[PDB]
Design an enzyme around this catalytic site. Structure first.
Site, PDB file in Angstrom:
ATOM      1  N   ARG A 143       0.873  -1.187   0.000  1.00  0.00           N
ATOM      2  CA  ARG A 143       0.000   0.000   0.000  1.00  0.00           C
ATOM      3  C   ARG A 143       0.894   1.216   0.000  1.00  0.00           C
ATOM      4  O   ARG A 143       1.814   1.344   0.813  1.00  0.00           O
ATOM      5  CB  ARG A 143      -0.897  -0.079   1.258  1.00  0.00           C
ATOM      6  CG  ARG A 143      -1.795   1.138   1.514  1.00  0.00           C
ATOM      7  CD  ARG A 143      -2.762   1.392   0.365  1.00  0.00           C
ATOM      8  NE  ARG A 143      -3.848   2.317   0.769  1.00  0.00           N
ATOM      9  CZ  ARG A 143      -3.724   3.629   0.726  1.00  0.00           C
ATOM     10  NH1 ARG A 143      -2.611   4.168   0.270  1.00  0.00           N
ATOM     11  NH2 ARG A 143      -4.757   4.393   1.062  1.00  0.00           N
ATOM     12  N   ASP A 191      -4.121   8.471  -1.025  1.00  0.00           N
ATOM     13  CA  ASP A 191      -5.395   7.736  -1.133  1.00  0.00           C
ATOM     14  C   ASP A 191      -5.892   7.950  -2.518  1.00  0.00           C
ATOM     15  O   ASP A 191      -6.182   9.080  -2.910  1.00  0.00           O
ATOM     16  CB  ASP A 191      -6.416   8.255  -0.087  1.00  0.00           C
ATOM     17  CG  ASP A 191      -7.632   7.342   0.059  1.00  0.00           C
ATOM     18  OD1 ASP A 191      -7.519   6.128  -0.188  1.00  0.00           O
ATOM     19  OD2 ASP A 191      -8.672   7.877   0.471  1.00  0.00           O
ATOM     20  N   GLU A 194     -11.451   4.283  -4.870  1.00  0.00           N
ATOM     21  CA  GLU A 194     -11.617   2.835  -5.125  1.00  0.00           C
ATOM     22  C   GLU A 194     -12.073   2.700  -6.572  1.00  0.00           C
ATOM     23  O   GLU A 194     -12.561   3.665  -7.170  1.00  0.00           O
ATOM     24  CB  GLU A 194     -12.641   2.186  -4.178  1.00  0.00           C
ATOM     25  CG  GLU A 194     -12.383   2.385  -2.699  1.00  0.00           C
ATOM     26  CD  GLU A 194     -11.146   1.653  -2.229  1.00  0.00           C
ATOM     27  OE1 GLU A 194     -10.881   0.572  -2.791  1.00  0.00           O
ATOM     28  OE2 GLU A 194     -10.438   2.165  -1.318  1.00  0.00           O
ATOM     29  N   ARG A 231      -0.285  -5.596   4.613  1.00  0.00           N
ATOM     30  CA  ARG A 231       0.259  -4.916   3.435  1.00  0.00           C
ATOM     31  C   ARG A 231       1.527  -4.179   3.780  1.00  0.00           C
ATOM     32  O   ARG A 231       1.617  -3.558   4.840  1.00  0.00           O
ATOM     33  CB  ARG A 231      -0.768  -3.922   2.773  1.00  0.00           C
ATOM     34  CG  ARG A 231      -2.094  -4.573   2.438  1.00  0.00           C
ATOM     35  CD  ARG A 231      -3.115  -3.573   1.900  1.00  0.00           C
ATOM     36  NE  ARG A 231      -3.416  -2.519   2.880  1.00  0.00           N
ATOM     37  CZ  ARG A 231      -4.299  -1.559   2.656  1.00  0.00           C
ATOM     38  NH1 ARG A 231      -4.960  -1.502   1.488  1.00  0.00           N
ATOM     39  NH2 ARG A 231      -4.434  -0.576   3.521  1.00  0.00           N
TER      40      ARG A 231
END
Ligand code: THP
Ligand code: CA
Length: 129
Positions: free
Chosen positions: A29, A34, A37, A75
């Site tokens: 990650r 960010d 999605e 992650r």
């Protein structure tokens, strides 16, 4: 911080990628960002961006920060480089990621990324459009 080798196993989405690191498969990650999605606005465009960057790279490298190297999902948390260019920074500079998840002591590149976000915002790029 220092750069270490890895090889691409598979693109996942705008801010996660599966790499082989010290010979073991792990999902990484991206620190300090960010992306939307896949199901959200600009999600597909973020996924495509990161996918092209990592798939076209001759050399993938991972750079851990000072702090936590794995998150609660297992992650890897790192800055990922494609032929020397930081994927995290590049996604923010294109307006396809926001600076986010800035935790104490894994924040070495925060100011670099906020500078990219400011330029993306000024250009009204993508998310900022
Ligand atoms: C980027 C990052 C995410 N995370 C955790 C916080 C969020 O927990 P929650 O799943 O409880 O919301 C999640 C967001 O990642 P995603 O944006 O990949 O969903 O991953 C960290 O713990 N450290 C980090 O540096
Ligand atoms: Ca995300």
């Amino acid at each position: 911080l220092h750069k270490e080798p890895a090889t691409l196993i598979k693109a996942i989405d705008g801010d996660t990628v599966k790499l082989m690191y010290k010979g073991q498969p792990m999902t990484f990650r991206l620190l300090l960002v960010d992306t939307p999605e896949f199901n959200e606005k600009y999600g597909p465009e973020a996924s495509a961006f990161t996918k092209k960057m990592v798939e076209n790279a001759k050399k993938i490298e991972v750079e851990f920060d000072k702090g936590q190297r794995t998150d609660k999902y297992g992650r890897g948390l790192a800055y990922i480089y494609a032929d020397g260019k930081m994927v995290n920074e590049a996604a923010v500079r294109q307006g396809l990621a926001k600076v986010a998840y800035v935790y104490k002591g894994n924040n070495t590149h925060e100011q670099l990324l906020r500078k990219a976000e400011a330029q993306a915002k000024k250009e009204k790029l993508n998310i900022w459009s």
